[PDB]
C-alpha cells in the first residue's frame, strides 16, 4: 500500500485524477462543517451528489492504476480493458444523472412549491470554480483515453449543472420569472446526453468486439494485398478488434499452395498488417491438397 | 402486431414469462404510485428494484434477438456480445439506483417525514405475496448452497419484508425513522444481489481467460510441447466471446524442417478437446 501511492503520482493522468479527487474531498469537508451548522436540507444532498462525483473520479483513478498492471495467466491481455470499461461506466452514469436532472426538473415545473434553501448562492459559485479548475486540468480529455474522455465529460456535465442553477437563481432574483429553471434543467439534460453519445458509441463498439473504425477502411486493401502474395489461395476467418485505445488484435487463416513459401508469406502478411496499424496479429497457414 | 394474438395462446414457458412480466411490472407501477402518493421511500425503492428485475428479462429477450443477427464486416464476430453487455448495463442501472436510493434514504435519516395512506400495510403484504408467487409458482425472477439461496429467494423477498416491517413500525409503535433505514437496507441488498452478475460480465469484457478453460490450459500447453518438432509456445490468448464460445490464439516455434500440417492438426485436436471453438495457430520455423 505504501508503494501504491508512488505509482499514482508517477503517471500524469493518475496524479491529476488523485489531486482533483483530493480537492473534491476537501470541498466535502468544508460542506460537512457548513451543513452540520444547521443547513442540512439542501446542503447535505448536494454533498452526497458531489460525493458521488468523487466516486466517479475514484473509479477513473482506479481504472488508470489497474490498466498498468502486469498480465498474468487469468488476464493474458493485461488489465487494459479497465480503460475502456471506465469510459463505459462513466458514460452510462452520466445518462443516469441526466434523468435525475430531467425528472427532478418537472418536480420544479408543474409543481408550484419552490421551497429552497440554497446557501445564499455561495456553495454554487465555489462548486463552479472547482468545475473550472477541473475542465482546465483535463482539457486533453475532450492506456488513458476513455478514462480522460469520461472524466472530462463528467466535469463538463457538472459545469452545465452549475450554469443551470446559477442562471435560475439570477432569473428568480432579478427578472423574477420561475419558468426558466425547468427549461434550463431539461436543456442541461439534453446537452449532457448529446455530449455523452460519442464516447458511449466507441465504448460499446470496442466491447462488442467490433472492427476498429480507424482500421475498417484499410482492411479490404490489406486483404487484396495478402491475396496477391505468390502461392496464397484464399483468405478466411478474418477478425480484427480493439483491445484498448490504438491497440488492435487481428487473426486470419490463409489457404496456400501445397509447396508454398510459408516463411515468406508469413513475413509479408505481418508486414501488410503492421503497415495498416495492427499490433498483434495471428496468421494460420493451411496447406492445400492441390 | 396482430401476430401476437395466437402467440399468447400456444405458449407454456413463454406463457409463464408473459404472466410474470405482466404482474411484476404492473405491481411495480402500483408500488411506485403508492410511494409517490405517500412519502415512504421503501415502497419506491422496492418498485425500482422489481422494475429493473423485469427490465433484465426484457433486455435479455432483446439481446437474444440481436445476438441472432448475421455477422458483417464491422461485426465479424456477430452481435453475440449483446447478451453480456445487456446484462452488464442492467446491473449498472440497478446499482446506480440503489446508490441513489441510499443517498436520498440517508437524507430522511436527518429529517424524517411522516405520511401514511391507510393502505401501506395492504400494498406491502401484496408486494410480498406477488414476489412469492413469481418466485415459487412461476420460477422466473431469480436474481442470479447459502449463496445460491441468498441470490435466489432472499435478495427479492427481504425488500418486501423490510417494507412490511416499516409499515408495522410506522403505524403501531409510531417511530419516524423506520423507512430511512429500510431504504438503506434495500440498497445494500440490491448491490449484494447485483455483484455476481457484474463480476461474470466484467470478466468476460476484460478479455479474461475463461474460468472453465483455465484449469485445463496447462495440460494443453504440455501436450502441445510434447508434439515432435515443437520447440516452444508463445503468446497464448484465450477469451470468452459469448457463453461457452471460446477464442484462442497461440504462436508455435517449430523445427526448421518440422511437419507443420501434422502439428497444426494435433494442436487443433488438443484445444478442441479442451472446448475451444475458434483457434488460431501461427507456426514459425526456427533457424536452428
Amino acid at each position: 500500500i505504501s508503494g501504491w501511492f508512488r505509482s499514482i503520482l508517477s503517471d500524469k493522468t493518475s496524479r491529476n485524477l488523485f489531486f482533483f479527487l483530493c480537492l473534491n474531498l476537501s470541498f466535502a469537508f468544508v460542506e460537512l462543517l457548513y451543513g452540520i451548522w444547521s443547513n442540512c436540507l439542501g446542503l447535505i444532498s448536494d454533498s452526497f451528489h458531489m460525493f458521488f462525483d468523487s466516486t466517479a473520479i475514484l473509479a477513473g483513478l482506479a481504472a488508470s492504476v489497474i490498466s498498468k498492471w502486469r498480465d498474468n495467466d487469468a488476464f493474458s491481455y493485461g488489465y487494459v480493458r479497465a480503460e475502456v470499461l471506465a469510459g463505459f461506466v462513466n458514460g452510462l452514469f452520466l445518462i443516469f444523472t441526466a434523468f435525475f436532472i430531467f425528472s427532478e426538473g418537472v418536480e420544479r415545473a408543474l409543481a408550484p412549491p419552490d421551497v429552497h434553501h440554497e446557501r445564499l448562492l455561495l456553495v454554487s459559485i465555489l462548486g463552479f470554480v472547482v468545475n473550472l479548475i477541473g475542465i482546465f486540468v483535463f482539457k486533453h480529455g475532450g492506456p488513458s483515453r476513455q478514462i480522460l474522455q469520461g472524466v472530462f465529460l463528467h466535469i463538463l456535465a457538472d459545469t452545465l449543472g452549475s450554469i443551470g442553477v446559477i442562471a435560475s437563481a439570477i432569473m428568480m432574483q432579478n427578472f423574477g420569472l420561475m419558468i426558466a429553471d425547468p427549461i434550463c434543467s431539461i436543456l442541461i439534460a439534453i446537452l449532457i446526453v448529446v455530449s455523452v453519445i460519442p464516447l458511449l458509441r466507441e465504448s460499446v463498439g470496442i466491447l462488442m468486439q467490433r472492427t476498429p473504425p480507424l482500421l475498417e477502411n484499410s482492411l479490404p486493401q490489406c486483404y487484396q494485398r495478402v491475396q496477391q502474395l505468390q502461392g496464397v489461395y484464399s483468405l478466411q476467418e478474418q477478425h480484427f478488434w480493439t483491445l484498448c485505445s490504438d491497440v488492435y488484435v487481428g487473426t486470419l487463416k490463409l489457404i496456400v499452395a501445397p509447396d508454398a513459401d510459408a516463411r515468406w508469406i508469413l513475413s509479408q502478411t505481418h508486414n501488410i498488417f503492421t503497415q495498416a496499424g495492427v499490433r498483434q496479429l495471428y496468421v494460420q497457414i493451411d496447406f492445400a491438397a492441390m | 402486431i396482430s401476430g401476437w394474438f395466437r402467440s399468447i395462446l400456444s405458449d407454456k414457458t413463454s406463457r409463464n414469462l408473459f404472466f410474470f412480466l405482466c404482474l411484476n411490472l404492473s405491481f411495480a407501477f402500483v408500488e411506485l404510485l403508492y410511494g409517490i402518493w405517500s412519502n415512504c421511500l421503501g415502497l419506491i425503492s422496492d418498485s425500482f428494484h422489481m422494475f429493473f428485475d423485469s427490465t433484465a428479462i426484457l433486455a435479455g429477450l432483446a439481446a437474444s434477438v440481436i445476438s441472432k443477427w448475421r455477422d458483417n464486416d464491422a461485426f465479424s464476430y456477430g452481435y453475440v456480445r449483446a447478451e453480456v453487455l445487456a446484462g452488464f448495463v442492467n446491473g449498472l442501472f440497478l446499482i446506480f439506483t440503489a446508490f441513489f436510493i441510499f443517498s436520498e434514504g440517508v437524507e430522511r435519516a436527518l429529517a424524517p417525514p411522516d405520511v401514511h395512506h391507510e393502505r401501506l400495510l395492504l400494498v406491502s403484504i401484496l408486494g410480498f405475496v406477488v414476489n412469492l408467487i413469481g418466485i415459487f409458482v412461476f420460477k422466473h425472477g431469480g436474481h442470479g448452497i447459502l449463496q445460491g439461496v441468498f441470490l435466489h429467494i432472499l435478495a427479492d423477498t427481504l425488500g418486501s419484508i423490510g417494507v412490511i416491517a416499516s409499515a408495522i413500525m410506522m403505524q403501531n409503535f409510531g417511530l419516524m425513522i423506520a423507512d430511512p433505514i429500510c431504504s438503506i437496507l434495500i440498497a445494500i441488498l440490491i448491490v449484494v444481489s447485483v455483484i455476481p452478475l457484474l463480476r461474470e460480465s466484467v470478466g468476460i469484457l476484460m478479455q479474461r481467460t475463461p474460468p472453465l478453460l483455465e484449469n485445463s490450459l496447462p495440460q494443453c500447453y504440455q501436450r502441445v510441447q510434447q508434439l515432435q518438432g515443437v520447440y516452444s509456445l508463445q503468446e497464448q490468448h484465450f477469451w470468452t466471446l459469448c457463453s461457452d464460445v471460446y477464442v484462442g490464439t497461440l504462436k508455435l516455434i517449430v523445427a526448421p524442417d518440422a511437419d507443420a500440417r501434422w502439428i497444426l492438426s494435433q494442436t487443433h485436436n488438443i484445444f478442441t478437446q479442451a472446448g475451444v471453438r475458434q483457434l488460431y495457430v501461427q507456426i514459425d520455423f526456427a533457424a536452428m
Partner: antibody, heavy 118, light 112 residues
Framework: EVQLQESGPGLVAPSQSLSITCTVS????????VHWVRQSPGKGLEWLGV???????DYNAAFISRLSISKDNSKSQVFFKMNSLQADDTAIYYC????????????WGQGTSVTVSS | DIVLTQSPASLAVSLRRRATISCRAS??????????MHWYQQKSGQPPKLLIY???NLESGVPARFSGSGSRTDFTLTIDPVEADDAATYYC?????????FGSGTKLEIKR
C-alpha cells in the same frame, strides 16, 4: 529422376507468338509449382512467371500484357505462350521446378534457345 | 523491383583457396529472421544449378565447400577449398518481392 524438357520453335518471326511445351517427369503438377525464366546475354536472367498447383498464375509486371501460362496435370505439361515477339526476346527459355516451401528454383530444364528474326 | 549488384564482375582464384562473391541489394530482402536470397551456379552450356537457398542453407546434394552468409542487403557466397569443377558463373536471386530478380552474375576464373 526429376526432369523437365521443353519443346518449342527455335526460330520465331517478329510480332508473332511463341509457344513452348514443358513436359515434366518425376513429380506431379498437383503439388509443385513451375516457373518460367529466360536468360539472354543482354540482360542476364529474368523471371517471367510461375504457375501453381491449382492453376493460379503470377507473372512479371513487364510481361503481364503478353504472357500466358497454362498446364495439364493428367498429361503433365505446362504451356508457355508469349505474344508480340520482338528482337530483344531472343533468349534461352527455362521451365523450372520450384523448390518446395522456398522461393528458389530447385530443378531446371535444359532450356531452349528462341531467336526472333525475319 | 529489387536490383542485385554482384561484385566483382570477375574474380580469379587459384586451387585449394577461398573464393568470395558478394551480392548487394537495393533494399532489405529479409523477413522475420529469414533472408530470401538464393545462390545459383551456371556452368557453360548448362542450366543454372541451385547451390544455396535462403542465403545460408546448403542444397541437398551439393558439396560442403560451398557456404553462404549475410543478411539484410549484403550477402556472401564462399567456396573453400576451390576445385577445378567450380569454373562457372554464380548468380544471386531474391524472392522477397514480386517479381523475382537475379543478380548480374560473376565469373569464377580458376588460376593455374
Amino acid at each position: 529422376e526429376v526432369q523437365l524438357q521443353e519443346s518449342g520453335p527455335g526460330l520465331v518471326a517478329p510480332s508473332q507468338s511463341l509457344s513452348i511445351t514443358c513436359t515434366v517427369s518425376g513429380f506431379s503438377l498437383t503439388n509443385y509449382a513451375v516457373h518460367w525464366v529466360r536468360q539472354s546475354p543482354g540482360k542476364g536472367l529474368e523471371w517471367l512467371g510461375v504457375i501453381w498447383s491449382n492453376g493460379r498464375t503470377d507473372y512479371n509486371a513487364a510481361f503481364i500484357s503478353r504472357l500466358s501460362i497454362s498446364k495439364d496435370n493428367s498429361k503433365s505439361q505446362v504451356f508457355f505462350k508469349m505474344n508480340s515477339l520482338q528482337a530483344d526476346d531472343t533468349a534461352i527459355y527455362y521451365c523450372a521446378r520450384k523448390l518446395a516451401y522456398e522461393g528458389a528454383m530447385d530443378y531446371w530444364g535444359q532450356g531452349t534457345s528462341v531467336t526472333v528474326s525475319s | 523491383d529489387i536490383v542485385l549488384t554482384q561484385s566483382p564482375a570477375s574474380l580469379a582464384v587459384s586451387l585449394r583457396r577461398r573464393a568470395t562473391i558478394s551480392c548487394r541489394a537495393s533494399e532489405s530482402v529479409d523477413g522475420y529472421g529469414h533472408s530470401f536470397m538464393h545462390w545459383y551456379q551456371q556452368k557453360s552450356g548448362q542450366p543454372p544449378k541451385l547451390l544455396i537457398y535462403r542465403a545460408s542453407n546448403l542444397e541437398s546434394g551439393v558439396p560442403a565447400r560451398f557456404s553462404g552468409s549475410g543478411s539484410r542487403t549484403d550477402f556472401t557466397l564462399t567456396i573453400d577449398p576451390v576445385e577445378a569443377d567450380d569454373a562457372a558463373t554464380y548468380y544471386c536471386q531474391q524472392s522477397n518481392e514480386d517479381p523475382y530478380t537475379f543478380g548480374s552474375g560473376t565469373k569464377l576464373e580458376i588460376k593455374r
